[PDB]
Structure 1
Amino acid sequence: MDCSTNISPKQGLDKAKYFSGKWYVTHFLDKDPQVTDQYCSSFTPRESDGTVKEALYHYNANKKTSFYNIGEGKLESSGLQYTAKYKTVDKKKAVLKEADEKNSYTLTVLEADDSSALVHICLREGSKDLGDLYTVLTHQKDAEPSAKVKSAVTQAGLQLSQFVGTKDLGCQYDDQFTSL
């Protein structure tokens, strides 16, 4: 399922609010009905002079497995949006696999305040699109997203009730990895 082509970052967002601390996905919306496994995710995005680098963590709640990555990209001029390439690393941040130049993901920030954020992610594997992925984030695990971010969800044409809540999945996180 192809990703939406009508996704743009919110104008006027302050980078400092998004590129700080660590983020936990509290709710997510995957539009592809063929998916089966549900994931938990946490990441730490940093930025310097328009260059973005982030440590990502995924935990497969169904198969009880996890994987780590390091994404690197550049900030678009338009807004808080960037397309990054990613390498695969272990829990110690050692490189297990270099980045495949044909793969990428574009992350678009739709809203972000001091406690939460809403982002859109489009992952691509060369030519195949994995489909739209919307994720609500908070700095505190299982915390409640702000009213401001919930409003962003509505404005995005989505219903919070359709999102999957991760606080009930029995998530396992590696706070050591995202800390720092």
Structure 2
Amino acid sequence: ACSTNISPKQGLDKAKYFSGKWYVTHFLDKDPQVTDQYCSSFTPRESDGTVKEALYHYNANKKTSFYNIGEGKLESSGLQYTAKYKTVDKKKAVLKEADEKNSYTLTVLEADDSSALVHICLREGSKDLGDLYTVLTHQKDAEPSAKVKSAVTQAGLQLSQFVGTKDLGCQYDDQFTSL
């Protein structure tokens, strides 16, 4: 199951996270449910205590993609939120409304002007799907900062064990993440 002991980084300025867009450069899926490798980019925003974020996934094996919009409330305790998610097309038109039994919780472990580290617990039945850690950069295929690489170690992980995305033949939809 996903860890219940993940807490966001204390003192982090949320503006460093809710800004620009993010590309996943490295991911650690602690308990994968499928064997395909994904690329992902997303654009998180917040307003008045509610996060809305536009999400994109690209299956590098199968060459398929899908789009979502997550929505949830910013924890008063720190940079963390539990979101419900709709399925959308590449123009953000809704294909399916959220299934309220499913959620994900995102916890920000580090963020600076170039890079971030987050933990995501996706619950896509009624079941934690297991921990996913993603290293993020504002620019595609860029190098994460030293600070973010330190945060990986401090989360008890080893960067050597992450899957990098730079060599996967990723295709992104930058128009979508710029909406």
Q: TM-score range by the shorter chain?
A: over 0.9
Pairwise CA distance, 1:15: 0.5
Q: Give me the TM-score of the superposition, normalised by structure 1.
A: 0.97
Matched residue SS, 2:128: strand
CA 1:159–1:93 in structure 2 vs 1: closer, same or farther (change >3 Å)? same
Bigger mean CA offset, 30-39 vs 44-53: 30-39
Give SS of 1:152's match.
helix
Structure 1 residue 158, shift from structure 2 partner: 0.3
CA shift at 1:126, angstroms?
Answer: 3.9
Instruction: Give 1:54 deviation, angstroms.
Output: 0.5
Given that 2:46 and 2:52 are in contact with CA atoms closer than 8 Å, whether structure 1 keeps it comes out as yes
| Residue aligning to 1:72 | 71
Residues 32 and 130 in structure 2, CA contact (< 8 A), matched pair in contact too:
no
Deviation at 1:49, TM superposition (A): 1.6
Which string of whole-angstrom CA distances, capped at 9 and with x for unpartnered residues, describes residues 47-105 of structure 1? 11211001000000001000000010100011000000000001111000000111100
Stretches of structure 1 that go unaligned for 5 or more consecutive residues are none
Rounded Cα–Cα distance in structure 1 between residues aligned with 2:77 and 2:67: 29
Counterpart CA distance in 2 for 1:124 and 1:90 is 22
| More deviation, 126-135/112-121 | 126-135
Q: 1:128 deviation in Å?
A: 1.4
1:34 Cα deviation from its structure 2 partner:
5.5
Q: CA RMSD in A?
A: 0.9
The corresponding residue for 1:119 is 118
Please give the alpha-carbon distance, in whole angstroms, between the structure 2 residues aligned to 1:34 and 1:99: 21
Q: How many residues align?
A: 178
Deviations 1:1-51 (A, max 9, x none): xx0111110110000000000000000001126531000000000011211
- In 2, Cα distance between equivalents of 1:44 and 1:146: 19
Partner Cα distance (2:153, 2:110) in 1: 12
C-alpha separation in 2, matches of 1:111 and 1:131: 20
In structure 2, what is the Cα distance between the partners aligned to 1:114 and 1:102?
A: 35
Distance 1:7 1:64, change over 3 A: same
Secondary structure of the residue aligned to 1:168 is: coil
Matches of 2:116 and 2:139 in 1, distance apart?
Answer: 12
Consecutive unaligned residues in structure 2, runs of 5 or more: none
Aligned equivalents of 1:88, 1:121: Cα separation in 2: 18
Counterparts of 1:34 and 1:91, CA distance in 2: 25
8 Å Cα contact 2:28/2:134 also seen in 1: yes
Q: Tell me how far 1:117 sits from its aligned partner.
A: 0.2
Q: What CA deviation, in whole Å up to 9, does each residue of 1:105-151 have, x standing for no partner?
A: 00000000000000000000241111100000000000000000000
1:13 aligns with 2:12: yes
* Contact 2:33–2:129 under 8 Å retained in 1: no
- Counterparts in 2 of 1:11-160, with a 5 A limit? 11-32=10-31, 35-160=34-159
When residues 57 and 33 of structure 1 are mapped into structure 2, their CA distance, relative to the original with a 3 A threshold, is: closer
